[PDB]
C-alpha cells in the first residue's frame, strides 16, 4: 500500500578520475594527515547560531585550517551588509541567456568570496516547478529540465570560477512547502510529506538538471526536507548512493538542509557527508554526528573508509574551486549587523569583533541591471511599448510601483508585500543596499525629457486614479504576487501561495485605470504565473510586461525595457487560463491520517507545458513565448545525422575503498583539558573512553545487521553503474547524434533579440508531444541573417528504461521542431538514421 | 520654460540652518544614509491628489487653499537623497 | 618530412599558388609506390583527428562563416584565382 | 560652475538639419559606424595650442582673433560618437 | 607567509627561485609563482610544491634528467633579486 525506497549500498567512494583528479589528490593528502576527531569536524556543523555563518563546521587548528562557512543564498550573500541583491533565478531563466547566468554566478561568488564564505547555498534545481503555486519556485529556474539544467550549469560555473564552492539544492522532489518538516497548522503528523515518483519520471524530469549540475563540476549538493518514497531525502540511500553518487558519478559532498538530518549511522551509510547546522534540533546540544560519529567509527558501526570519504569529498570540493588560493577570513556575522558581539550567538558567549562591514559589491550593479532588463517578458503589445520619451503626462499607478514604508530591509527575510516586489521571502534572500523603484526611475526618465508625472501608490484611492488616468497620455499600472519559504506566513500564504491571483488589491486598480485610460501598460512583478483571464484582453490594455523579481536595480532595469533600449526575453513558464489547467494541486490537508502525507507524482513528466500540450489545453501565453520590438522568421531547417558510435553501457568495477590513516583509539578522542566547553556547542570529542556513556543514545548497542540494510559496510570493489561512469552519467550519453542548423532573419525595422528554441518529439505513445532540448539568445540588426547551429546528444533523444536501468533511443521516430516558443514552431524534420 | 532653475535656487537659498554641531554639510563619503519620516516621501494619492492640496500625506511643499497650484511633479527628499547617496557609492534606506 | 615526423602541410603548396605540393598528389603516389608505409600516413590522419575529437570539434562545430582574404559579403571561394562566387562573409559577432 | 549645461543645450539646439532622406536620426544600433574627416578630431597641438585659435588643425569649435577664449577641454565629434556607438555595442573607426 | 604591511589592498606576485648548485648552473632559476590579493595587515600562507624536474638538470651523457649532488637552495621573495628568505633542500630523513 505505502511507497517504498529500496536500499542501495555501499555508499560510493570518490574515485579520483577525470576533471576531479588534481582535487582528489590534494584532498587525500590533506585528510591523510588527520586524526579521527579532526575528520569528524569537517562533517558536523557546530550548532545553530554557534559561529558566524548560517552553517559552519569546526576548525582543524593543528593545521591552521579555519573550518568551512556555508552561507545563503542563491541570489546573493544573506544576512550581511554592503552586498548586492541580484535578480531571482526565475528572471535568469527568463533571459534564456547562459552567458548572463554565468556572469551573475561570477558576481555572486565574488561577494561570497570577499565575505570569507566557502560554500554558497545555491543554485536551485529543486523545486523544479511541479506546482505553479509552490512557494519557492522563484528561487529556482523553470519547470523544464533542459532550461533549468543549462542555467544550473552556467550558474555553478560562474560561482566556482569565482573561487566559491556551489551547492545544488534541494535534492530531491522538494516541490512544495506545506508539510516539508511535518506538523504545522495544528495537524499532528509524525513525519514530513513524502514525494513518490516513479523511476522514469525521476529520470526524465527532476534528476536531469542535477546531472547537468554535477556534470558542470558542482562541489556540493543539499538534500531536502521531504521524504522520497517514505525515506527522508537526507537518509535516502537510493537518491544519494544510487542516483547521485553511482549513476551521476558525483564526486563532491552532500549536506543536509537545516534540520533535514534524521539519523547518525543510517544517514552516514546512506550517503550523507555533512550535517547542517550540526545538531538534531536548533540548539539541542545533541548531534547525530559529532561525538556520535567519533563513537560510531570507534565501535565499528561505520567503517573508517566512509568517514574518510566524507572528509575527502568535502576537501575535494574545497580544492576543486581553489579555496586554498583565496585567503579571506570570515569578516561578517549572520545573526546581527553589530560591529561587536558574541561569537557564540546562540548562548550569548565569546564577545569579539564580528562584523568588519566589508564592501563586496564592486561593479556588480551592472550585471543586475542587465539581467533585470533582458529578463522582462513582453506578453502583449498593441503599440503601448516602447515609450517614446516625450509623453506629455505619465501616470504610474499601484502600490507595486513604490517602496516599502518600513525600509528596503524592513521585514525580516523579506516577509511582506508592502510595495514593489523584487525578491520573494525566506532563506533565499539577501539584504538590499537600496532598491530603485519603478516610481523613482520612471519619474526620473519622464522628467529628463520634460514630461509631467504623477505616482498613485494607494490601491484604495480609486477616484484619484480614475481622475489622473482620464488625463494621462500613458498609464503604467503595477501589480504583484508574492511567495516564499513556509516558516513565514504572509496574509494566509504559508510559503505556498493560497491562490494564483494578484496581491495588494491590484485587480481593481487594473480595472479602474483600464476603464479611464486607453493606453494602459501593465507591469507584473510575480514569483510565477498569475491568472489574468479577466483583464489581459481588455482593449485599453495596450501592453503587458512581466518583470519578475529583478533585485536592487528594479526600476533602472525596467526603464531600459520600457523605452526600447534593451529587448525582452521569453516566459520560462506557462500562463494558463485557470489553476486546474496546471494540475498537480498542493497538498494543504493531511491525506494519510496521522502519518506522513503522500504526494504521488501521478502526472509523471506531465507538468507545465508538457501537460498543456498533452491534454490540448490552450494557455493564454505558452512556455517559451515573448514578443519582440521587431519580427523574426525561421527558414532552411536541416537535421544532419551524425554517425555516432553505438551506445556503450558502462561496465567494470570501482577500486576497493581505502582508509587514509591508522585506526584511532578512544583514548585519543577525549575533550582536551585546555578547551572551555561552550554550552550547546557541537564537538567531535568523547566524555570518556566508555563509548556507550559518551554517546548517550537510548538505543545504543545493536549489531549492524539488526538496524542497517545488507552491504552497507561492504568496502570491496563495486559494479560501475551501466548508466554511470563519469560526472553526469555515462560519457557515451553525451555523444553527438545530430547537427541541427536553421536560418533566423530579422524581417523588421529595428534591431532585436530572438530566443530560438529546439524541441524534440521522442515519438512514443507515452512521451510528451515535444520537449525542449536546445535554445540560444541572439541579437540581429534589421535584415540580418543568422545560421543557428545546435548539436543534439544521445541523451537528448533517449528515454529512461526502468527494465534495463539505462537510457535507450526508442524505435519511434523523433521529430525536431524549431522556432521561438513551445507552440510557434513553423519548421520540423524527422531525425533520420545515419545513411 | 526654464522656471525649474529659479524654483530650485529659491528652495536652496530659503533653507535655514538653525543648528549645526558638525552634522552639515554631508561629506559625500557616508556609507549608509537613513531617511526617516513620512515628510520625506510622496503623497500616495498622487501629487495633485487632494483638492487644493487639502491634506498632509507626504512631504510638505505647499499649504492648502486658493494659494496653490498644480504640480507638474514633485521631487521628494527621499527620491533626491537616494540619488545623491547612490551616486557616491553609499547604501540607503528610506523609512516613511 | 613525412618520415621525419611532419603531419600537416600548410598552406599546402610548395610555394604560394605554385600548383604543386610536396604532398597532395605526391603523398598519394609515395604511399602507392611503397616509399612511405601506410602506417605513417594513417598516423598523420589519426593524430589530426585525435586533436579534433580531444577538444570536441564533433560537439562544437559550426560551418565556417567568414573569409580571411576580404571583408565583402560576396566573393570567390577560391580567392587566389578569382573563382567560385558565393556568400563568404556572414558577419557574425563573436565578441 | 555648471555652464557646461547651457553650452551643451545651445550646441545641440543650434544644429541645422539641411538635408535628410533617411540618414538622421541614428538608431543607436548600427553595427559599424565610420567617422571621416580631419574636422572630427583633435588639434594635435592641444586645445589651446594656437594663439587666439589661429589655426584649423582639427574640429572647429571657434574662429580666431579676440573673439575667443581658452577651452577647459574640447570633446571632439570623434570622441563622443565613439563613446555612444560603443555604449550600444557597435563597432567603429575614425579616419582623420 | 606573505603579509600586507601597508594601508591599502594590494596584489603581490610571490616568486620561488632555485639555485641548482653546480659551477655551470645559473645563480638562480624561477620555479614557482602566484598572484595573491591581500587586504591591509592580512597574512597568507603561500604553498608551492616542487617536482623532480624543477631540481634536475639535463644530462647529455645519460640522455636523461638528473638531480645533481650539489646543494639546491630555494629562494623566496617578489622579484629575481628581492629574495630575503632562502634555505637549502635537505634529503628526506
Ligand atoms: C489571493 O491571495 C492574495 C494574497 O493573500 C490576497 O491578496 C489580498 O487581496 C485583497 C482583496 O483585494 C486585498 O485587500 C483589498 O485592499 C483594497 C485596498 O486596500 C487599501 O485601501 C483601503 C481603502 O482605502 C480608501 O478608503 C478608506 C475608506 O474606506 C479610506 O480610509 C482611505 O483613506 C481610502 O480613501 C479613498 O476611498 C474613499 C472611498 O472609499 C474616498 O472617499 C477617498 O477620497 C479615497 O479615494 C483601506 O481601507 C485599506 O486598509 C488599504 O489601505 C481594498 O479596497 C479592498 O477592500 C474592499 O473589498 C474588501 C473585500 O475584499 C472589503 O472588506 C472592503 O470593505 C472593500 O469592499 C468594497 O470593495 C469591494 C470590491 O473591491 C466590494 O465588493 C465591496 O462591497 C465594497 O464596495 C464598496 O467600495 C468600493 C470601492 O472600495 C466601491 O467601488 C463600491 O461602490 C462600494 O462603495 C480589499 O481590502 C489585500 O490587500 C490583499 N492582501 C495582500 C497582503 O496582498 C487576495 O485576497 C486573494 N484573492 C482571492 C480572490 O481570495
Ligand atoms: C556505535 O555507536 C553508534 C553511535 O551512537 C550507535 O548508533 C546507534 O545505533 C542504534 C542501534 O544500536 C540506532 O538506533 C536504531 O536506529 C534505527 C534507524 O532509525 C532511523 O532510520 C529509520 C528508517 O531506517 C531505515 O532507513 C535507514 C536509512 O535511512 C536504514 O539504515 C534502516 O535500516 C532502515 O532501512 C529500511 O528502510 C529503508 C527505507 O527507509 C529501506 O531502504 C531499507 O531496505 C530498510 O527497509 C527512521 O524511521 C528513524 O526514525 C524513527 O525514529 C526516530 C527516533 O528514533 C523518530 O525521530 C522518527 O520520527 C521515526 O519514528 C531513524 O531516523 C531504528 O530503526 C531502530 O529502531 C528500532 O529498534 C529500537 C529499539 O532498540 C526501537 O525503539 C524502534 O521502535 C525500532 O524497532 C523496530 O525494529 C526492532 C529491531 O531492533 C524490532 O524489534 C521492532 O519490531 C521494530 O520494527 C533504532 O532506533 C541509532 O540510530 C544509532 N545512533 C546514531 C546516533 O547513529 C551504535 O549502536 C553503536 N554500535 C555498537 C556496536 O555499540
Ligand atoms: C519509488 O517507488 C517506485 C516504485 O517502486 C520506484 O520505481 C521503481 O524503481 C525500481 C528500481 O529501484 C525499478 O526496478 C526495476 O524493475 C524492472 C522491471 O520492472 C517492471 O515491472 C514493474 C512492477 O511489476 C513495472 O511497474 C515496471 O514499469 C516494469 O515493467 C527490472 O527489469 C529491474 O531489474 C534489474 O535492475 C535491478 C535493480 O534496479 C536488479 O536488482 C536486477 O538484477 C535487474 O538488473 C539486471 O537485469 C536487467 C534485465 O534487463 C539488465 O538489463 C540489468 O543490466 C541487470 O543485468 C545483470 O543480470 C543479468 C541476469 O539478470 C545478466 O545477464 C547481466 O549480464 C547482468 O549481470 C528492476 O527491478 C522499478 O521498475 C521502478 N518502477 C517504476 C514503476 O518505475 C522508484 O525508484 C522509487 N524511488 C525512490 C527514490 O526510492
Ligand atoms: C573542532 O572544532 C572546534 C570548533 O572550532 C575546535 O574548537 C576550538 O579549538 C580551539 C583550539 O584549541 C580553541 O581555541 C582556544 O580557545 C581557548 C579557550 O578559550 C584559548 O585559551 C586558546 O588560546 C591559547 O592558544 C592560542 C593558540 O592556540 C594562543 O595564541 C593563546 O595566547 C592561548 O595560549 C595560551 O594557552 C595555551 C593552551 O591553550 C598554551 O599552550 C600557551 O602557551 C598559552 O599559555 C585557544 O585560542 C577554541 O576555543 C575551540 N572552540 C570552542 C568553541 O571550544 C576544535 O579544536 C576542533 N577539533 C579538532 C580535533 O581539531
Ligand atoms: C547521539 O545521537 C542520539 C540520537 O540517535 C542522541 O539521542 C538523543 O539523546 C537524548 C539524551 O539521551 C534523548 O533524550 C531523551 O528525550 C526524551 C524526550 O521526551 C526524555 O524523556 C529523556 O529525558 C530523560 O533523560 C535526560 C538525560 O540527559 C534527563 O536530562 C531528563 O531529565 C530525563 O530524565 C531524554 O532526554 C533523545 O530522545 C535522543 N534522541 C533520539 C532521536 O534517539 C544523543 O543525544 C546523541 N549524542 C550526542 C553526544 O549528541
Ligand atoms: C611533387 O614534388 C616535387 C618536389 O619534390 C615537385 O617538383 C617540382 O616540380 C616542378 C615542375 O612541376 C619543378 O619546377 C621546374 O623547375 C625548373 C628549374 O630547374 C624549371 O625549368 C621548370 O620550368 C619553369 O620555367 C619554364 C620556362 O619556359 C616554364 O615554361 C615552366 O612552366 C616553369 O615555370 C619548372 O618550374 C620543381 O623544380 C620541382 N621542385 C623540386 C623542389 O624538386 C612536383 O611538382 C610535385 N608534384 C605535384 C603533382 O605537385
Ligand atoms: C509592512 O509589512 C508588514 C508585514 O506584512 C505589515 O504588517 C502586517 O499587517 C497585516 C495587516 O495589518 C497584519 O495582518 C493582520 O493580522 C491579524 C492578527 O495577526 C496576529 O498574529 C500574528 C502571528 O501569526 C502576529 O504576527 C501579529 O502581530 C498578530 O498578533 C489579523 O487578525 C488581521 O485580520 C490581519 O490579517 C499582520 O499581522 C502584520 N504583520 C507583522 C509581521 O507585523 C504592515 O502592515 C506593512 N506596512 C505597510 C505600511 O504596508
Ligand atoms: C597646426 O596649425 C598651425 C598654424 O596654422 C600649423 O602651422 C602652420 O603650418 C603652415 C603649413 O605648413 C605654415 O605655412 C608656411 O608659411 C611659410 C611663410 O611664413 C611658408 O614659407 C611655408 O612654406 C609654409 O607655407 C604656417 O607658417 C604654420 N604656422 C605657424 C604659426 O607655425 C601646423 O602645421 C598645424 N599642425 C598640425 C600638426 O596639424
Ligand atoms: C477605454 O478607454 C477610453 C478612454 O480613453 C474609455 O472612454 C471613456 O469612457 C467613459 C465611460 O464610458 C466615457 O464617459 C468617456 O466619455 C470616455 N472618454 C473618452 C475620452 O472618450 C473607454 O470607455 C474604455 N473602454 C473600456 C471598455 O473600458
Ligand atoms: C471602479 O470600477 C468598478 C467596477 O470594476 C466600479 O463599480 C467602481 O465604481 C469604479 N470606481 C471608480 C472610482 O471609478
Ligand atoms: C558529559 O558529561 C557531563 C558531566 O561531565 C554530563 O552533564 C553530560 O550529560 C555528558 N554528555 C553526554 C553526551 O553524555
Ligand atoms: C551483497 O552484495 C553482494 C554482491 O557484491 C551480493 O552477493 C549479496 O547478495 C549482497 N548481500 C545481500 C544480503 O543482499
Ligand atoms: C526641458 O526644459 C528646459 C527648459 O526649457 C530645456 O532647456 C530642455 O532643453 C528641455 N528638454 C527637452 C528634451 O525638451
Ligand atoms: O539557511 C540554509 C537553508 O535553510 C533552509 O531552511 C532552506 O530550505 C535551504 O534552502 C537553505 O539553503
Numbering used by the authors:
A (entry chain A): 21 to 855
B (entry chain B), D (entry chain C): 382 to 477
C (entry chain D): 287 to 381
E (entry chain D): 763 to 855
From the publication, what sentences describe this entry?
The GH3 Cel3A from the thermophilic fungus Rasamsonia emersonii (ReCel3A) is a more efficient additive to enzyme mixtures compared with HjCel3A. Biochemical characterization of ReCel3A revealed a substrate preference for disaccharides over longer oligosaccharides. The GH family 3 BGL Cel3A from R. emersonii is an efficient supplement to whole cellulase mixtures for the production of fermentable sugars from lignocellulosic biomass. We also present the three-dimensional crystal structure of Cel3A from the moderately thermophilic filamentous fungus R. emersonii solved to 2.2 Å resolution.
